[PDB]
Design a binder for this molecule. Structure first.
Ligand code: KD4
Ligand code: MG
Ligand code: ZN
Length: 313
């Protein structure tokens, strides 16, 4: 019972920073996640046997796609850990429990295609879930794994607390639908500016948690430039494969997804930082000030993308 997870000195130190990379050793990631859950939640929170059983089942249900894989899950969860550690007096016991799990499960069974491809292909999931197609499937997959024998990590929780944690996980996994981000950030920016933003209001808390979810999901843009540069290849590998699949459906894909337009990537990445990433980290920083290193790191990679266009690399 008195077992504590201990990371090697370098990892132990670096894991507390927003720009930490979990490395290339697959086998260390479950230990990295368990360590994060113990420092963020406590050794008590989950039964180590149930938690490790749940982690392996979640890993098992993540596909071998270039980007939206198991490594993405553990990275998105790490970024959440970094946020929760720099704002620990702001989150409930249940929120700390649910958010690291939601991040771990957020892209469960992701096939590497967007909601648009699912919609255009007429995939069964698009008939089952009209909007936030994959995100509703990811939550559905999270519940399926929680219902497996010996996998209920929230067994100790009351009937009411279990329904609260599951609702935190649901809202958070749906929030990773980038289509919803735009309106959520606009509503949060307005509430913050008119001083009406109250963290005691549950609907306001839901919105802030949604913004934290977009921030972690896009945390690839907040790492040191070599990590960002290499992660962009994986992101575009999926994009180009979906572009190829749109062409198979007889639909010319958007240039972002066209592998014949690889030369337009630095300009498209510049557009992404301006339209999505910088607004996301700016509003997040106004709301939760210790998350400033995410915005700082993001602005540095935006500058690196400008250097790419200018022929500086
Ligand atoms: C055009 O670039 C993009 C489009 C949509 C989502 C994206 N997510 C990430 Cl994290 C990055 C680095 N780029 C994105
Ligand atoms: Mg998503
Ligand atoms: Zn994701």
């Amino acid at each position: 019972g008195l077992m504590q997870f201990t990371l090697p000195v370098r990892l132990c130190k670096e894991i507390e920073l927003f720009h930490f990379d979990i490395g290339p050793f697959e086998n260390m990631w479950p230990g990295i996640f368990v360590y994060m859950v113990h420092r963020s939640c406590g050794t008590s929170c989950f039964e180590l046997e149930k938690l490790c059983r749940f982690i392996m089942s979640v890993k098992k249900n993540y596909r071998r796609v270039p980007y939206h894989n198991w490594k993405h899950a553990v990275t998105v969860a790490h970024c959440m850990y970094a946020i929760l550690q720099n704002n620990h007096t702001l989150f409930t016991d249940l929120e700390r429990k649910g958010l690291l799990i939601a991040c771990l499960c957020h892209d469960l069974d992701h096939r590497g295609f967007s909601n648009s491809y699912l919609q255009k292909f007429d995939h069964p999931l698009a008939a089952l879930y009209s909007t936030s197609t994959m995100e509703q499937h990811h939550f559905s997959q999270t519940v399926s794994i929680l219902q497996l024998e010996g996998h209920n990590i929230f067994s100790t929780l009351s009937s009411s607390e279990y329904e609260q944690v599951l609702e935190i996980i649901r809202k958070a996994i749906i929030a990773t639908d980038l289509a919803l981000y735009f309106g959520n950030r606009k509503q949060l920016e307005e509430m913050y500016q008119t001083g009406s933003l109250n963290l005691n209001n549950q609907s306001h808390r839901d919105r802030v948690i949604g913004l934290m979810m977009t921030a972690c999901d896009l945390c690839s843009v907040t790492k040191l430039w070599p990590v960002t540069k290499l992660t962009a290849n994986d992101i575009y590998a999926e994009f180009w494969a979906e572009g190829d699949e749109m062409k198979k459906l007889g639909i010319q894909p958007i240039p972002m997804m066209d592998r014949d337009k690889k030369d337009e990537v630095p300009q498209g990445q510049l557009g992404f930082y301006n339209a999505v990433a910088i607004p996301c980290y700016t509003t997040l920083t106004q709301i939760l000030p210790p998350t400033e290193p995410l915005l700082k790191a993001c602005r540095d990679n935006l500058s690196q993308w400008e250097k790419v266009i200018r022929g500086e690399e």
